[PDB]
Point group: C2
Chain length 87, copies 2
């Protein structure tokens, strides 16, 4: 399997967006933040269990997204903290 | 296991950073993007984007800080070699 090539990182101007949540201390090893454009290709990211927020970008203007936040201990995901927002 | 609570989404104004790359057509199911501070441990952010994507945008990073990225191509249940690089945030 050929590795990806030509990695480039550069500044870009767009709207940023933050998600906040509450959770018991030392309860989860990590948090699964699975978001996707409503009725569309989903993005699954994983932050450390000590985090209580994460910021998003690269979202299409004038549409709707759906976000589910899971509490993960080991590999066991808790119940989804779900929501939907308009960009 | 209890679910996290009080999900509030607010608008924030800050620097947005884009990662770009190239890959053969329909060669991978997804791409594993993994980044963390250079001198930090146990706080790496691993994310997964569809295998058709050739770009991903980032925010909420600490200004004036060097991070490290590694992007693997994912086909089936296996990954390719990493595409690693370093970068310093502005501010």
């Amino acid at each position: 399997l050929p590795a990806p090539k030509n990695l480039v990182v550069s500044e870009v101007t767009e709207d940023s967006l933050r998600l906040s949540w509450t959770a018991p201390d030392a309860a989860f090893d990590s948090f699964l933040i699975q978001y996707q454009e409503s009725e569309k290709e989903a993005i699954n990211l994983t932050v450390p269990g000590s985090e209580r927020s994460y910021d998003l970008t690269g979202l299409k203007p004038g549409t709707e997204y759906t976000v589910s936040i899971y509490g993960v201990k080991g590999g066991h995901r808790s119940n989804p903290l779900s929501a939907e927002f308009t960009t």
